[PDB]
Amino acid sequence: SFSGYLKLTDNVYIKNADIVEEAKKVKPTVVVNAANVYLKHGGGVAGALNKATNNAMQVESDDYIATNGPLKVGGSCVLSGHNLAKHCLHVVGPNVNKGEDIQLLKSAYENFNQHEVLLAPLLSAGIFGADPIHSLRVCVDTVRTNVYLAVFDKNLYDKLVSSFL
Ligand SMILES: C[C@H]1C(=O)NC(=O)N1c1ccc(Cl)cc1
């Protein structure tokens, strides 16, 4: 199971880790992807997860979009986890760099409540432009299921833990 995590709350755990390496090690039931509405996994966590699947995540995602159309900001879909997990929960947090409503971050985290346990990144953090401290606060105040957060950046991990209320 998950190891080396700091406990933040009854159900939220955090570790300074590369989510791809963490997923390959744990092979969790669910890995969360920091997806966009088009499931175009170009960069950030999505680009890294997709590259780890040898692009199989992108091939599956293009078929999903061709059939269903784009996701909503704040929405999600469950697809295969490929070699990383049983399932990948593609969750769309608002991208502040595209002028999307930060208020949708709570709706994005609510998707996690449909899964008993998840390995996840902080939604809307990184290239999505939101404040990761705010993302962690919304996470702990929204998610009720067991969420294991992987924060790639050591300096950001330290800032998140030390400023956690
Ligand atoms: C991409 C995001 C993540 O999932 N884990 C991180 O440490 N992230 C990250 C966010 C902001 C900056 Cl400047 C650097 C890294």
UniProtKB/Swiss-Prot annotation:
Residues shown, of full length: 1027 to 1191 of 7096
Catalytically driven reaction(s) = Thiol-dependent hydrolysis of ester, thioester, amide, peptide and isopeptide bonds formed by the C-terminal Gly of ubiquitin (a 76-residue protein attached to proteins as an intracellular targeting signal)
Signal sequence region: none
Recorded topology in the membrane: Multi-pass membrane protein
Where the record annotates domain Macro, the positions are: 1-165
Q: What organism, scientifically named, is this protein from?
A: Severe acute respiratory syndrome coronavirus 2
Q: Write out the function statement from the record.
A: Responsible for the cleavages located at the N-terminus of the replicase polyprotein. Participates together with nsp4 in the assembly of virally-induced cytoplasmic double-membrane vesicles necessary for viral replication. Antagonizes innate immune induction of type I interferon by blocking the phosphorylation, dimerization and subsequent nuclear translocation of host IRF3. Also prevents host NF-kappa-B signaling. In addition, PL-PRO possesses a deubiquitinating/deISGylating activity and processes both 'Lys-48'- and 'Lys-63'-linked polyubiquitin chains from cellular substrates.
Q: What is this protein called?
A: Papain-like protease nsp3
Protein location? Host endoplasmic reticulum membrane
Q: What influences the activity of this protein, per its activity regulation comment?
A: Inhibited in vitro by GRL-0617.
Q: How does it assemble?
A: May form homohexamers. Interacts with N protein.
